[PDB]
Amino acid sequence: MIDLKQYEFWFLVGSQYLYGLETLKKVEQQASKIVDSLNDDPIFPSKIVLKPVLKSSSEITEIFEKANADPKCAGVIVWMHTFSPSKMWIRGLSINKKPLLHLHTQYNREIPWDTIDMDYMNLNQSAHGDREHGFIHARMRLPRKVVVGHWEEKEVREKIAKWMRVACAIQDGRMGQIVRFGDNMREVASTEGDKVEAQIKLGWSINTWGVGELAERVKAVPEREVEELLKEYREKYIMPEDEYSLKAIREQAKIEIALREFLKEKNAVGFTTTFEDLHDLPQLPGLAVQRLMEEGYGFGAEGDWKAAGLVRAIKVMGTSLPGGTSFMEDYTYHLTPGNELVLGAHMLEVCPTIAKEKPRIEVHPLSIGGKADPARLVFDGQEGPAVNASIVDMGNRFRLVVNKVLSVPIERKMPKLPTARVLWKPLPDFKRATTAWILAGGSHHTAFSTAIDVEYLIDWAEALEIEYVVIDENLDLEDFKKELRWNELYWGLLK
Amino acid sequence: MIDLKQYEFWFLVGSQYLYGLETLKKVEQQASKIVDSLNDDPIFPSKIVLKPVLKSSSEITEIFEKANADPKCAGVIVWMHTFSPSKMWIRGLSINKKPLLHLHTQYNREIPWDTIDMDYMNLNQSAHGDREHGFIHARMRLPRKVVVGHWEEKEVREKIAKWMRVACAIQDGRMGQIVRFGDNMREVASTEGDKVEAQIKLGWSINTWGVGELAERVKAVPEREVEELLKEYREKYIMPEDEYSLKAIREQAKIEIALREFLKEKNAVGFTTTFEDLHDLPQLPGLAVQRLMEEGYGFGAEGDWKAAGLVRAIKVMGTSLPGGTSFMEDYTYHLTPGNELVLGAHMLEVCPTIAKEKPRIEVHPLSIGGKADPARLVFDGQEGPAVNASIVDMGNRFRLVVNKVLSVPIERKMPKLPTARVLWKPLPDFKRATTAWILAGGSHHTAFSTAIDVEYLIDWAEALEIEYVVIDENLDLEDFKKELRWNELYWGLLK
Amino acid sequence: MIDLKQYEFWFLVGSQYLYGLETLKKVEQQASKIVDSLNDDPIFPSKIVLKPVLKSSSEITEIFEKANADPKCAGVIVWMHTFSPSKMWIRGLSINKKPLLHLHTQYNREIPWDTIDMDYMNLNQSAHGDREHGFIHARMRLPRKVVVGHWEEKEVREKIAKWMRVACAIQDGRMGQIVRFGDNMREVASTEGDKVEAQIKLGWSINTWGVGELAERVKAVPEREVEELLKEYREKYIMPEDEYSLKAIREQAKIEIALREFLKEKNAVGFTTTFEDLHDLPQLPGLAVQRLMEEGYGFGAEGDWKAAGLVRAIKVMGTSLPGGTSFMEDYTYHLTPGNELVLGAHMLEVCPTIAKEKPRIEVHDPARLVFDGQEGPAVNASIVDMGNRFRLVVNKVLSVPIERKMPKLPTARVLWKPLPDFKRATTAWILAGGSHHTAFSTAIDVEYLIDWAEALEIEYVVIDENLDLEDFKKELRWNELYWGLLK
Ligand SMILES: [Mn+2]
Ligand SMILES: [Mn+2]
Ligand SMILES: [Mn+2]
């Protein structure tokens, strides 16, 4: 249970010393009235601090210098109520490395056709005000998200909420670390990337340990805790009775505790493992990974820290009741000429946030990583639209491929499927989407989410200055190619 | 009449040692069950050779090192039946320069919802398998067409068979020569190019001979050959009776013998001439040129070796009955407000393969290249959708301008047009499709084709890594103007 | 003790069909006369397999196809006895991914001033022949090493020989694998890199194994073999008497065998460990890594697979008797204004190939080898991942004898003066962003690494005695474009 309400977004209001101290107080008053009314609408999942109205050059850098310092400040929102000369913003936007939202709004909705004097016009210069401020953004190449509309209107409140989550997700990643029990699966390429380029460009701290450091913890678990976890299990899951099924549940319980004590110690947010390197671990970690991920931790099997750190960040976005974000691996295809589906699952680890019903603890024999039959949760995937993403290292940079999909109800049950499953249509056609994915060269290790819109992932790349490529219903393949080889240069040398 | 049944494409399947030794046989059985059913389908104009399951790096390089060696292996198909670590593939794909198709498929259409156990999941890891292997093509920038679908379904088979025809038209381009009889027409630009760059980029070996080398062949022709062809002419064409008309036919026959002896001697695929440099040649080459093209020999006029090499490369694609590729020069227009057509012809040379009626031999005096009145075939053009291609050299690189056309039947006869004619509407509008053609700067010397779709040329430029610019029905004049300046960069520095 | 005399270097000759059928045989016989005496010279450590004189455009590919297909072919030498038009070479050079030498020689030394008819001039069209063949190498941007000189004159023989040693060090890397035990030291950056970008560029397959996988090998070692190494330790090294000292030797013995068996089991050229993951391992690898490095295996500590893969590649270049290459780590500094030295060593692992005297075994528990640094000129190098690309920083140094012994230094030490000044060389090394983990070689000269990087199309930056610092900054920033967007 990791939340994001502790995070605050600094609202920033613009004018200049070269104005009457009466109208500057009229915008201070006016802005206050906006954020007061804003912070009361529960669509926003974090605070909005309203800092003094910025007139001077020095006041710009000041507020920024402090906004970069403060670990609770997950983003900035900038809005010029009156004309703010922007050559005051430069030395402030030079020093600011936090996500930007440009909110292009005007306190009053309608034009007072009988009360629009120079007195008022001077107060509400908002129309031109943050066009001048809009250029200096574009002219500096600063990454930001411009949004136009009255704060009264909800559609704009939606757009800024999508950003807020994404902006706070980024910090829960720059702050966070990725724990790696052992390195990648041997001779695998997609899972692999530049550990250094991730800390430079995403701020993703990432460190590898031995598996023997985890094994020393799993054998050291108080026995009176594991039975106090099995009494919580019975409240949700648990197999018929005690057997060789429930010896695995007591083994995964003493694995779950050993991680959670380890993941706090190293400032972790997303971890990763490997199924061919589980020495001194009496069982493959399975039910222990599904529980941790339920709490919010990012995960990626076969050492894949890209997917792990993506699951984490896209988890942090998917807080709202529409909730639903897992770690997915496209395992098999339905190729029926009209309904070309794709069954999404893994060898074990599917997050129960996308569980349509009560997740069912099951144990089945599996040869992969020759050790005791592990426990796992079984449940039919959630219907309704979703997104499937994947970050992948292109040597010099990263790219984010994202497949908008339409999760369909599971039409036939599966008596011999041990893993929880999901069924979806890769939009538009499965051929066009999955041809585009591979053209782009996404990881096999993908990031499923039922919570979040595609827009979220677009704002995420936009605010980290990396390529993103969207597999929408409006997917021309010939167009997508041209996009791939055009993008390649922009993000390649420039940034 | 060079066919391509001789040409073979290598079917490569990927796994890893880190599996049961007997499931690798299960893949061996299963791949065979595919490529055997595939080769029994006669849409594929070349053979397919299944090679043993690839598990180790060693095997990946050892197959690829051979795939460049065998001159009849004109491309490789690649599909991962299970998860195949791509770092195995790097040294292999690093070394490969034969066109790639990435077949993404699954041996069974539907998922056995009641019999899918972890032993079966392990066997068909085909979904997440060639995503991972997909990434290594994207990250190493390796040019390849990817295709997705089930090897049963005809859509996927369509794509791969249109690639095959293209990949073997590349090998019948690198392998062959271009034989010129004189340089380029004086002061003509789009016909000129770097005959050296061609060989580095396209492999097109190209050289130039004198005209007197041909003159020494036309005078040394046995008189029992010119009359053995005439008896084969009468079987198809021939002008009414013995007259000054049937003297031109006995001059084109010996030119066809000389040309034949030359191009076979030089292992030629295309050739090119010039109407201002034919010294010691009693007559301008024409009916002989049109006869050589009816076999499959490429040709350009005015020295055009760009057009000459395309005609061939697009000829080799068109072997099957739909056949119909020529050598075109957009001659005149019908600027009628509704039905804006274009009349593609030449001073003489147009390939009969596009004829819709019996080619009629005709002789008419023409002032282009001072010498005796040459013989030509006169016929109506073939109706139906066609494409009008032109390569041309932009210093650093080449681009492929392809104007899909809708070839209409000729409404009225022309009792005063000497040369065989064609009438089309350049899609979409004549104005758009031309105003775009001139923008992309297409050669006037094009390669008309009523055999192939745009599909072929796109797979071509894709595989050779050159700029392609299509003139679709979807042609947003401005959008095209943005494509030309964006593509500029990509194909300039990178490639 | 992995050799490179198996490797063959295909000598390619250039003529055209468009010649008298006779003269082509005088090119074949004359080339045969060149390589026959050439192979006879022992300065070349790898064979030379002359291949039929190449006239046709088709023959050029065929040999290059053969040249990429044969694993033991680790280079191609080229020389155009007569004028060989280059547009025959294009389709063949395109398909070639094996290091290239353009030899520019003439079978006769002098010009027979009295006897130089067109019948001879048209046979030794060697000058303008490979002058025309040079352009196409320049035009396509193909990597190759151009040499000039009559085959008899030892100077050119050297220049090609160093290439040979380089090229075969490349092929013992494209074929080889780098075995990591554990990842890099946590939060360390110069060790870290793009594992997949390296296989592409440097051909180095690289994969990691959990440290546990090794421990199962060291515990399963026959105890009656670990003595069979102790018996061979006694033939060269060993500590005074049976003591805890020797339980640290039996524990390094049983680590070396396991490393041997594990680095045999896979076609492994270089390896790497880390000191903060050795769970289930009863000791830190030290002696057992110095022994293996003495044989030829490349090593880097704290996971550094970059320094590891270089040490291997630069160990294969170092084969001849002037041998001496070790995995170095510049530890401390003597700052004395006149004799500005540096005391290179490591936490443990220093290769005994640069040993002046008898290597002594010392246990301080990790077991080391105590020996002085080999004097005279050497080279220090480091490969580092600039994210997009790679760069190889190489610092020429003048290793000096050690003036006073150190009774309380457990690790083997090497003293050297980084050329020109200590200030310049080191300021430059840091500007260029060299790894702390280096490859120290007394065996080879700069020349080797220059022809290595040139051959792999990666930036190299030299710290010569001719090191203008200002000019070096400008040289860093101008290199970063070329190796950036282009390669
Ligand atoms: Mn996986
Ligand atoms: Mn013309
Ligand atoms: Mn170190």
Residue burial A317-351, b: 16+ Cβ < 10 Å; e: rest: bbbeeeebbbbbbbbbbbbeeeebbbbbbbbbbbb
Among A189, A337, A367, select the one facing B86 at the smallest CB separation: A189
Which helix (H) or strand (E) segment is C250 a member of? Answer: helix C244-265
For chain A, positions 428-447, list CB contacts with chain B under 8 A.
430-431, 434-435, 437-445
- The count of C-alpha atoms lying within 13 angstroms of the C-alpha of C62, restricted to the half-sphere facing its C-beta, is 9
3-state secondary structure of A447: strand
Peptide bond into C420 cis (omega under 30): yes
Q: Residue B191: nearest ligand to its CA?
A: 2
A217 CB-contact burial (10 Å; exposed 0-12 / middle 13-18 / buried 19+): middle
For chain B, positions 44-83, list CB contacts with chain A under 8 A.
57, 83
The Cα–Cα gap between A386 and A325 comes to 9
Give the torsion sign (CA, B275, B281, B285, B289): negative
| Residue C267 in contact with partner chain A when CB distance is under 8 A | no
- The runs of H, that is alpha helices, within C70-117 are 90-94
The Cα–Cα gap between C157 and B249 comes to 65
Choose, out of C186, C188, C214, the residue to mutate when testing the contact with A (most A CBs < 10 Å).
C186
Of the candidates A395, A404, A474, A397, the residue with the CA atom closest to the CA atom of residue A446 = A404
Distance B329 CA to ligand 2 centre (A): 6
Record the tokens describing residue A286, joined without a space: 């399975």
For chain A, positions 180-239, list CB contacts with chain B under 8 A.
185-190, 192
Which helix (H) or strand (E) segment is A407 a member of? Answer: strand A398-407
3-state secondary structure of B440: helix
A31 CB-contact burial (10 Å; exposed 0-12 / middle 13-18 / buried 19+): buried
Q: Please, are residues C322 and C207 in contact by the beta-carbon 8 Å criterion?
A: no
Name every residue whose Cβ is closer than 8 Å to that of residue A52 and which is 6 or more positions away in sequence: A28, A59, A63
Of the candidates B362, B346, B265, the residue with the CA atom closest to the CA atom of residue B311 = B346
Record the tokens describing residue A490, joined without a space: 């922009």
Q: Residue A329: nearest ligand to its CA?
A: 1
Q: Please, are residues B103 and B77 in contact by the beta-carbon 8 Å criterion?
A: yes
The Cα–Cα gap between B291 and B259 comes to 11
Beta strand B73-79 pairing with B100-104: parallel
Among B68, B90, B493, select the one facing C95 at the smallest CB separation: B68
The Cα–Cα gap between A25 and A27 comes to 5
- Length of chain C equals 487
Record the tokens describing residue C291, joined without a space: 């022994």
The Cα–Cα gap between A369 and A282 comes to 11
Of the candidates C69, C83, C13, C11, the residue with the CA atom closest to the CA atom of residue C44 = C11
The Cα–Cα gap between A391 and A401 comes to 7
Q: Using the beta-carbon criterion (under 8 Å), do B205 and C91 form an inter-chain contact?
A: yes
Give bridge partners of residue B198 from the DSSP assignment: none
Chain B residue numbers with beta carbons less than 8 Å from the beta carbon of C200 are 90, 94, 140
Which helix (H) or strand (E) segment is B48 a member of? Answer: strand B47-50
Q: Please, are residues B414 and B373 in contact by the beta-carbon 8 Å criterion?
A: no
Choose, out of B63, B95, B98, the residue to mutate when testing the contact with C (most C CBs < 10 Å).
B95
Name every residue whose Cβ is closer than 8 Å to that of residue B365 and which is 6 or more positions away in sequence: B373
Among C189, C205, C210, select the one facing A210 at the smallest CB separation: C210
Beta strands in A95-214 (DSSP E): 100-104, 144-148, 177-181, 205-209
Look up residue C54 and give its amino acid: L
Rg of chain A (C-alpha set) = 25
Method used experimentally: X-ray
Chain B residue numbers with beta carbons less than 8 Å from the beta carbon of A330 are 127-128, 131
Chain A residue numbers with beta carbons less than 8 Å from the beta carbon of B83 are 444
- Length of chain B equals 495
CA C287 → CA C76, C250, C365, distances in Å?
39, 11, 12
Of the candidates B224, B264, B472, B245, the residue with the CA atom closest to the CA atom of residue B372 = B245
Q: Using the beta-carbon criterion (under 8 Å), do C87 and B205 form an inter-chain contact?
A: yes
Any binding-site annotation on A137?
no
3-state secondary structure of B437: helix
The Cα–Cα gap between A395 and C484 comes to 12
Q: Please, are residues B83 and B91 in contact by the beta-carbon 8 Å criterion?
A: no
The Cα–Cα gap between A381 and A415 comes to 15
Distance, C-alpha C37 to centroid of its chain: 27
Closest CA–CA distance from residue C367 to any residue of chain A (Å) = 23
Which helix (H) or strand (E) segment is C51 a member of? Answer: none
**Residue in chain B lying closest to C69 (CA):** B65
Q: Please, are residues A241 and A214 in contact by the beta-carbon 8 Å criterion?
A: no
Closest CA–CA distance from residue B214 to any residue of chain C (Å) = 18
- Length of chain A equals 495
The Cα–Cα gap between C54 and B113 comes to 62
Distance B423 CA to ligand 3 centre (A): 76
Say how many CB pairs under 8 Å bridge A and C.
86
The Cα–Cα gap between B445 and B349 comes to 11
Q: Please, are residues C472 and A479 in contact by the beta-carbon 8 Å criterion?
A: no
Record the tokens describing residue B488, joined without a space: 């500029």
Measured N-to-C along each axis, helices C211-219 and C244-265 cross at an angle, to the nearest 10 degrees, of: 120
Q: Which chains touch C (3+ CB pairs under 8 A)?
A: A, B
Give bridge partners of residue C441 from the DSSP assignment: C325, C379
Chain B residue numbers with beta carbons less than 8 Å from the beta carbon of C139 are 196, 200
> If you search the block for the tokens 């006369």, which residue do you land on?
C33
> If you search the block for the tokens 């805790």, which residue do you land on?
A225
Beta strand A384-393 pairing with A375-378: unpaired
Q: Using the beta-carbon criterion (under 8 Å), do B118 and A334 form an inter-chain contact?
A: no
Say how many CB pairs under 8 Å bridge B and C.
56
Peptide bond into B143 cis (omega under 30): no
> If you search the block for the tokens 């005051």, which residue do you land on?
A88
Q: Please, are residues C327 and C312 in contact by the beta-carbon 8 Å criterion?
A: no
Closest CA–CA distance from residue B72 to any residue of chain A (Å) = 27
> If you search the block for the tokens 């009349």, which residue do you land on?
B343
Q: Using the beta-carbon criterion (under 8 Å), do A186 and C207 form an inter-chain contact?
A: yes
Look up residue C183 and give its amino acid: D
SS3 of chain B: the string is: CCCCCCCEEEEEEECCCCCCCCHHHHHHHHHHHHHHHHHCCCCCCCEEEECCCECCHHHHHHHHHHHHHCCCEEEEEEECCCCCCHHHCHHHHHHCCCCEEEEECCCCCCCCCCCCCHHHHHHCCHHHHHHHHHHHHHHCCCCEEEEECCCCCHHHHHHHHHHHHHHHHHHHHHCCEEEEECCCCCCCCCCCCCHHHHHHHCCCEEEEECCHHHHHHHCCCCHHHHHHHHHHHHCCCCCCCCCCHHHHHHHHHHHHHHHHHHHHHCCEEEEECCCCCCCCCCECCCHHHHHHHHHCCEEECCCCHHHHHHHHHHHHHCCCCCCCECCEEEEEEECCCCCCEEEEECCCCCCHHHECCCCEEEECCCCCCCCECCEEEECCECCEEEEEEEEEEECCEEEEEEEEEEECCCCCCCCCCCCCCEEEEECCCHHHHHHHHHHHCCCCEEEEECCCCHHHHHHHHHHHCCEEEEECCCCCHHHHHHHHHHHHHHHHCCC
Q: Residue C182: which region, alpha, beta or left (left: phi > 0; alpha: psi -120 to 50)?
A: left
Peptide bond into A322 cis (omega under 30): no
Q: Please, are residues A426 and A434 in contact by the beta-carbon 8 Å criterion?
A: yes
Give bridge partners of residue B12 from the DSSP assignment: B78
Any binding-site annotation on C110?
no
The Cα–Cα gap between C462 and A428 comes to 55
Backbone dihedral angles phi then psi of residue B463, each to the nearest 5 degrees: -80, -35
Record the tokens describing residue C486, joined without a space: 């282009």
Of the candidates C330, C331, C416, the residue with the CA atom closest to the CA atom of residue C373 = C416
CA B126 → CA A330, A402, B148, B220, distances in Å?
9, 20, 12, 63
3-state secondary structure of C379: strand
Give bridge partners of residue B401 from the DSSP assignment: B390, B469
Q: Please, are residues C275 and C300 in contact by the beta-carbon 8 Å criterion?
A: no
3-state secondary structure of A43: coil
The Cα–Cα gap between A268 and A291 comes to 16
Look up residue B388 and give its amino acid: N
Q: Residue B267: which region, alpha, beta or left (left: phi > 0; alpha: psi -120 to 50)?
A: left
The DSSP call for residue A353 is G
Residues with CB under 5 A from ligand 2 (ion): B 301, 329
For chain B, positions 77-136, list CB contacts with chain C under 8 A.
87, 90-91, 94-95, 97, 136
3-state secondary structure of B227: helix
The Cα–Cα gap between B259 and B253 comes to 10
Q: Using the beta-carbon criterion (under 8 Å), do C199 and B97 form an inter-chain contact?
A: no
Any binding-site annotation on C329?
yes
Closest CA–CA distance from residue A248 to any residue of chain C (Å) = 23
The Cα–Cα gap between C154 and C38 comes to 10
Among B140, B195, B203, select the one facing C200 at the smallest CB separation: B140
Distance C383 CA to ligand 3 centre (A): 15
DSSP B3-23: --SS-EEEEEEB--SSS-TTH
Distance C128 CA to ligand 2 centre (A): 38
Q: Please, are residues A73 and A98 in contact by the beta-carbon 8 Å criterion?
A: yes
Distance, C-alpha B45 to centroid of its chain: 14
Give bridge partners of residue A406 from the DSSP assignment: A385, A425
**Neighbouring C-beta atoms of residue A225, cutoff 10 Å:** 13
> If you search the block for the tokens 């080619």, which residue do you land on?
B359
Distance B187 CA to ligand 2 centre (A): 13
Backbone dihedral angles phi then psi of residue B469, each to the nearest 5 degrees: -130, 110
Beta strand B341-345 pairing with B360-363: unpaired
Resolution (A): 3.5
The Cα–Cα gap between A315 and A322 comes to 12
SS3 of C131-184: the string is: HHHHHHHHHHCCCCEEEECCCCCHHHHHHHHHHHHHHHHHHHHHCCEEEEECCC
Any binding-site annotation on B223?
no
The Cα–Cα gap between B474 and A369 comes to 53
Q: Using the beta-carbon criterion (under 8 Å), do A207 and C196 form an inter-chain contact?
A: no
The Cα–Cα gap between A178 and A268 comes to 6
Chain C residue numbers with beta carbons less than 8 Å from the beta carbon of B493 are 485-486
